[model samples]
Target: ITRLQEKEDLQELNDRLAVYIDRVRSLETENAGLRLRITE
Candidate 1:
């Protein structure tokens, strides 16, 4: 019974993490390009 709740909770946690992870990845990609532009 408790195990079932934990399994669901884990998915929810990952859902939130996935959203933030995508944002971070997008930001890092832009930052990398911005650095190259700056050197020019």
Candidate 2:
């Protein structure tokens, strides 16, 4: 039971991390788009 609980906890942590990373990825994409516009 403890191991299962730990596994669930890790999954939840990953989900939280994924959400942050997704936003970060979008932000980076936006920044790259702006840089491209400036370059051209």
Candidate 3:
């Protein structure tokens, strides 16, 4: 039971981390777009 609980906790943490990574990726893409426009 403890192992199962730990696994669930880890899964939750991973999900939250994935969301953060996606957000950062989106922001980086937006930044690149703005930079391209500025250079153009």
Candidate 4:
């Protein structure tokens, strides 16, 4: 039972980490676009 709870917690943490990683990637993409615009 204890192991099941730990597994569930890890799954939730993994999901949150994935979401944050995706957000970071999107922000980096936007930053690149803005940089190009500025230099132009």
Across 1-40, the per-residue lDDT of candidate 1 in tens digits comes to 5998999999899999999999999999999999999998
| Stretches of model 3 off by over 4 angstroms after superposition | 1-5
Encode model 4's per-residue lDDT on 1-40: one tens digit a residue. Answer: 6999999999999999999999999999999999999999
Best by TM-score, which number?
4
How high is the CA lDDT of each candidate model?
A: 0.96, 0.98, 0.99, 0.99
lDDT per residue as tens, model 3, 1-40? 6999999999999999999999999999999999999999
Question: Alpha carbon lDDT of residue 21, candidate 4?
Answer: 100
Give candidate 2's whole-model lDDT: 0.98
Which residue pairs does candidate 2 place in steric collision?
A: none
Alpha carbon lDDT at 14, candidate 4: 100
Local accuracy of candidate 2 as per-residue lDDT tens digits, 1-40: 6999999999999999999999999999999999999999
Worst lDDT run of 10 residues, candidate 1, spans 1-10
Candidate 2 regions exceeding 4 Å error are 1-12
Model 1: residues with Cα > 4 Å off, grouped in runs: 1-10
Model 4, TM vs. native: 0.80
Arrange candidates by TM-score, highest first: which order? 4, 3, 1, 2
User: Cα RMSD (Å) per model?
Assistant: 2.2, 2.6, 2.0, 1.6
